[PDB]
Ligand binder design. Structure first.
Ligand SMILES: O=C(Nc1ccccc1)Nc1cccnc1
Length: 185
């Protein structure tokens, strides 16, 4: 792909983070803590899952960023509406305002309803995410495998401003402590 020149500098929004997340000083890395991180509750925080949003809001144009997923067993990545549900249980679907892919139990799936099997020969260590607001497109790229396409959501009905979306996943296994990291331009 040739989307690299739409690169945007994403930072994480602490106020949206689940209360167990640890976000680095530079707001470019996030991991699951082993306990509550001693923050006050608020209506923005994701309560049920280890999720956080980027601070940036997008309503036009073409945007591209990259995320490092090295050694993680489970995660979700993509974009979502600014007005997605924060509290309680919900599924990641375009009906609920999410355009995402994930790793879970050694398989990769796109967050359609119902979910779609992805075909990845080279497990990615870094994922590229491309949004074309006007075109209604969200695409995912395997940076480890020379930028090969993973998945394209097309005919997207964003219906609002978009924010970068992250889930570091639970760490019940003791094998999923590694962070998500926003990779440098
Ligand atoms: O896993 C960690 N580092 C890392 C992992 C993969 C790639 C790059 C860095 N950090 C960590 C985890 C648990 C407690 N303290 C620190």
């Amino acid at each position: 792909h040739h989307h690299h020149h739409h690169m945007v500098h994403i930072t994480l929004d602490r106020n949206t983070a689940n209360s167990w997340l640890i976000i680095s000083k530079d707001r470019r890395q996030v991991r699951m803590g082993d306990t509550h991180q001693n923050v006050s509750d608020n209506k923005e925080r994701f309560s049920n899952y280890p999720m956080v949003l980027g601070a940036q809001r997008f309503s036009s144009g073409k945007m591209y960023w990259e995320v490092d997923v090295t050694q993680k067993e489970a995660w979700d990545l993509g974009v979502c509406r600014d007005s997605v549900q924060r509290k309680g249980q919900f599924s990641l679907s375009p009906e609920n305002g999410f355009w995402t892919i994930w790793l879970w139990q050694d398989s990769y799936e796109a967050g359609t309803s119902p979910q779609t099997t992805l075909h990845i020969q080279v497990p990615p260590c870094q994922i590229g995410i491309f949004v074309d607001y006007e075109a209604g497109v969200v695409s995912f790229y395997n940076i480890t495998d020379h930028g090969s396409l993973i998945y394209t959501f097309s005919e997207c009905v964003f219906a609002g401003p978009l924010r970068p979306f992250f889930n570091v996943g639970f760490n019940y296994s003791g094998g999923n402590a590694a962070p998500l990291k926003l990779c440098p331009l």
